[PDB]
Design a protein around this ligand. Structure first.
Ligand SMILES: Oc1noc2ccccc12
Length: 284
């Protein structure tokens, strides 16, 4: 069923809450035993958001290999993403270690450091060229190279140096700065424009490690980003662009990380983004 018609049907009936609860009911449930070990309590921002053991990213150290991050691998679409929480004061070094070890080219950030008057994640990147950051626990150095501030997003060029080997890489920071404190954007135009900027960079392409994507918990706004990307990619690959069932794509993604899409408004916004984005993907 063409999703644009499914969309108008759900909207006229006002059954977004009912669709959403059906997804919650059918979603996968797998063990998260490593996340719940007492030694990892200060490595988790939220007590009810944990990576599944089967799909968690492991840090390459013998000490403690744990980070709140999951590898989402979409077989048909041929895309991988790592979804993670906003770094904590004691996990900033783990975060950049993961970026290094997984060979990521891009970091996508969908929240502000402060929202609703509270801290949603650590200030984990340098704000001035001449004031670089050093992560002593993981032996990395991070330098701001350049900054391009636009109305809806900011792109930063960063240099990440493995102090152990003195290799350096360029990381692109894509920061979406205008998601509202409550609800979802009224139009997806600016979100879609942001997605196409990340795509244009090469950060989502198979010659790099997976893109690292985060918000505060790494399930809501982060979920919306990778669901929309994957759905538009499938609508270009397959011979019938109307085979693409957004609910089935979401349940496939929820086999890799719990809670992707946090509200019935985020589910509706995801539909709107895919429907509006398709009017480029089909030749315009
Ligand atoms: O309709 C379709 N064309 O190509 C496909 C591949 C997978 C699933 C559905 C379809």
């Amino acid at each position: 069923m063409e999703m644009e018609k499914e969309f108008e049907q759900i909207d006229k009936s006002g059954s977004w809450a009912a669709i959403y609860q059906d997804i919650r009911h059918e979603a996968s449930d797998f063990p998260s035993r490593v996340a719940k070990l007492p030694k990892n309590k200060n490595r988790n921002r939220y007590r009810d958001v944990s990576p599944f053991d089967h799909s968690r990213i492991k840090l390459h150290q013998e000490d403690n290999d744990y980070i709140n991050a999951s590898l989402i691998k979409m077989e048909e679409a041929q895309r991988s993403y790592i979804l993670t929480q906003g770094p904590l004061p004691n996990t900033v070094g783990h975060f950049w270690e993961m970026v290094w070890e997984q060979k990521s080219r891009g970091v996508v950030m969908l929240n502000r450091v402060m929202e609703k008057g509270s801290l949603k994640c650590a200030q984990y990147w340098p704000q001035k060229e001449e004031k670089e950051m050093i992560f002593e626990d993981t032996n990395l150095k991070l330098t701001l190279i350049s900054e391009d501030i636009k109305s809806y997003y900011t792109v930063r060029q960063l240099e990440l140096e493995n102090l152990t080997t003195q290799e350096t890489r360029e990381i692109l920071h894509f920061h979406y700065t205008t998601w509202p404190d409550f609800g979802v954007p009224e139009s997806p135009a600016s979100f879609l424009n942001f997605l196409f900027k990340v795509r244009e960079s090469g950060s989502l392409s198979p010659e790099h490690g997976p893109v690292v994507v985060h918000c505060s918990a790494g399930i809501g706004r982060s979920g919306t980003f990778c669901l929309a990307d994957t759905c538009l990619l499938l609508m270009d690959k397959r011979k019938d662009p109307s085979s693409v069932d957004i609910k089935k794509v979401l349940l496939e993604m929820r086999k890799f990380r719990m809670g992707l899409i946090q509200t019935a408004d985020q589910l509706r916004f995801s539909y709107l983004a895919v429907i509006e984005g398709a009017k480029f993907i089909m030749g315009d």
